[PDB]
Amino acid sequence: ETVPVKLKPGMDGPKVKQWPLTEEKIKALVEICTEMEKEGKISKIGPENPYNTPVFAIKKKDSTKWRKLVDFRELNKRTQDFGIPHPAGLKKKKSVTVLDVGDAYFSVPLDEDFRKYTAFTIPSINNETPGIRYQYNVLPQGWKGSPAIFQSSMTKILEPFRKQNPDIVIYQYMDDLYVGSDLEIGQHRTKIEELRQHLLRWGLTTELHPDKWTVQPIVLPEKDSWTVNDIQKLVGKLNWASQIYPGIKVRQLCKLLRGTKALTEVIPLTEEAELELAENREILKEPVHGVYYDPSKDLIAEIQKQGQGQWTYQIYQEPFKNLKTGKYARMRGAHTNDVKQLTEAVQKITTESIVIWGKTPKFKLPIQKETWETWWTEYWQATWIPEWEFVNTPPLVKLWYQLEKE
Amino acid sequence: PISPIETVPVKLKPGMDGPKVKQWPLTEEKIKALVEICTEMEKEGKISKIGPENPYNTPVFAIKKKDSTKWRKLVDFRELNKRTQDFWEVQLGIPHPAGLKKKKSVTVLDVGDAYFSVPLDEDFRKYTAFTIPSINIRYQYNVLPQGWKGSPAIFQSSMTKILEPFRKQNPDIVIYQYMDDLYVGSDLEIGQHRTKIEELRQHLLRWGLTTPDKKHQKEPPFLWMGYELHPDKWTVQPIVLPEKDSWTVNDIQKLVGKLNWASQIYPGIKVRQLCKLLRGTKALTEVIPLTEEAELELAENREILKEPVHGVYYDPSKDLIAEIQKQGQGQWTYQIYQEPFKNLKTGKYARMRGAHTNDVKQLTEAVQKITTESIVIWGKTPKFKLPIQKETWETWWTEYWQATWIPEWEFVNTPPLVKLWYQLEKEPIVGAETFYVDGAANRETKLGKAGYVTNRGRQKVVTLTDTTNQKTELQAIYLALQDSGLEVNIVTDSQYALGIIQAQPDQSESELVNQIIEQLIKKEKVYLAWVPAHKGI
Ligand SMILES: Cc1occc1C(=S)Nc1ccc(Cl)c(/C=N/OC(C)(C)C)c1
């Protein structure tokens, strides 16, 4: 028996255009789809169905086998909401492990009348062939309603491992299961493998470190002698920084800056300026008081290209009231590609948001839409897809976070 | 002939009802004709008579043809089409000639009146109701009606199913449907090819779909959107330009249009002076005196369009090469080929400077655009031969604020190379003079002052009428640049100058910024520094 799923009142199904795909992945999808059709998971559809959702194929980390991924963001946004629990435990765990339990959904049938809305299309190179149109008959991976409907079965399936191991945390966010334990790596890895078998046994098949992620302080430079330029740079940063920490003062230094001196001119600090600075260093030794996460408001992630392979980010809900901030160094191998590094970073950051608040952040990316749209899929390796917008990084915000400690 | 194929379920938009529009009174003759014509398809079972239980109606009129003066009929489904549901995209794009492979032979079967062979959803049929009047006769369609929104869509998918078996049986044959034409190509020997065609023909015939005989069907060369397709190569129809005495504005526009399309295949084509003839045009039909600069240009273009162009098709076993050239500031030409000088495709782009850019950023955008069309056509991206040194690229991209990338490429020394016009110093220049520039203007009165004072005692100030703050600030920076020597340190509090430091643009929409840019380039070493406003600094 199937549960009746509906679109939020007044909405209509998604009619998103398919992005062009490479030969390599069109073939991969054709293969994957013919098979899924045999198994009865999906079915060919005619023109009478006007809806569409983009599809593509990615290759998992350590897996040289193509995996089909759909972009349900639009559908999910139009899909009605529906006990969806998030614990603050794995936030503190010594280790967490993500598990791909997407396969489970394919067993469960999807309400007949909602099926139309899951239409997708495999394109043809040079439009020499019409698109191959399919639609899901079972629960779609990457859809929000799926983990929802599969809830019951899921809880049952896990309860035994749960009750026999309440010292472990298990969190389900869409196609993934986050398993965290403080148990040393030996027991953790072994216990995970055991859990896998526990799942495998039912049919369906499938390291992180939370308490090591610290918000770093903003360290200010230190010289034996300061030049007019050094001071100017320092003052500029502090002045901007006072929007976060209102206790930051800059007048005493600004005083030394009065007078048209050469930038290379060396200036000794007045004892008053020396204090002012020492005082500021203190305020910067810790994050601003008063920042509390609000579940009813969107989470936001800003990323700034720092060059040399470095990237900086800040998760917040209100500008300047950052819940978390961090620095990311490019993965070994992406020594020439920015899109590669950026996507990796986008994923890493999303994961953390999930672990902590169980919610994906809306990204503000320092890249041109065209560049992103063209190559993001090539390096994506997650079942979910967060929201994003493209922006122009204010130079000031960049110079600031460049100052984080190591 | 009607066919025994599953009708596709069709319904009207949510909450809408069928057409109910007035039937024009015709002539005793037009009525005569339509009576005859309708009785024809009536006997064929295409249309059936209906009684008063149908409150819908679509206007039907008569029209004499080109080849016979004999009357044809026309049904105006405009209204019905408004009330009909939407179907998925009919054709998601046309195949570009450069993405085709060569075939030994290509034949097109005109499945002409096939719309009228595919049965319409029985339920929907009622909406197709129409009326043949009298001087002082109801029917409805039982088959896809010429003109109805869903016809092409449904017809296509039908043709798709019907061909699935023949395609499987013959994986060495290529069929491509477009409208009511069926293009079929292959690499089989002419006799074998001829046979398969007939086999297909009889396969479609088995479904009532009539097709033209070997005696009557079409053959190559084919016309495909500007191209002249051959089994061996494609050719561009030498574009004809009308040499005339009196030119009207409208005429110039159309001319510039055709010329612009041409430039994709024929770099060299210019329309700069031809465009000038449009300035201040009061009417579309006003005649314009062709400037001699325009005469020399229009002429030089006829010469270019004399030499035709024939390229080659795509060979999957060969690598794809894309080469790019900068014809001018913001102008790039590219040609994709597999074997040198044997071009598959060519094109060009003109980039309206916009806010503020630089050549390297622009090159990047071309590469990006090319990469996208490549993937659509060949399903893969080309190896790039770019007029830029690996050193230059590395220096720029590693520091640029925005994420950017260029796929596997290789430097090709084809002048003029794109290069970094200037690079601001990372730290203050020792020895160099230091200009503390500042500018302010009254927003409302548009009155301002711009100036500077240096660590060497030099100073200046200028009063500006009809200026804005941003202009003043930049102007301050311009002056500092003018009066400074080869090496300069400049401090400003301008929020907009922060942009230049980060982006280091070599072109902008603002002529003023451009002035500053020219000056920056002239300098040997420039160090720009920003400081917050209204402070000590
Ligand atoms: C997709 C296709 O349909 C029929 C032939 C072909 C191919 S791959 N090669 C090819 C080779 C020579 C010619 Cl002349 C044409 C004709 N193409 O016409 C269209 C683009 C309508 C298929 C096509």
UniProtKB/Swiss-Prot annotation, chain B:
One further remark on this entry is: Error-prone enzyme that lacks a proof-reading function. High mutations rate is a direct consequence of this characteristic. RT also displays frequent template switching leading to high recombination rate. Recombination mostly occurs between homologous regions of the two copackaged RNA genomes. If these two RNA molecules derive from different viral strains, reverse transcription will give rise to highly recombinated proviral DNAs.
Q: Where is this motif: Tryptophan repeat motif?
A: 393-409
Its source organism is Human immunodeficiency virus type 1 group M subtype B (isolate HXB2)
Q: What is the effect of changing D67G?
A: Confers multi-NRTI resistance
User: Which consequence is recorded for altering K103E?
Assistant: Confers resistance to atevirdine
Q: Which residues form the RNase H type-1 domain?
A: 429-537
Mind telling me what this protein is named? Reverse transcriptase/ribonuclease H
Annotated site location: Essential for RT p66/p51 heterodimerization = W396, W409
Q: What is the effect of changing L229A?
A: Complete loss of RT dimerization
Q: In the UniProt annotation, what is the result of changing G185T?
A: Confers resistance to efavirenz, HBY 097 and nevirapine
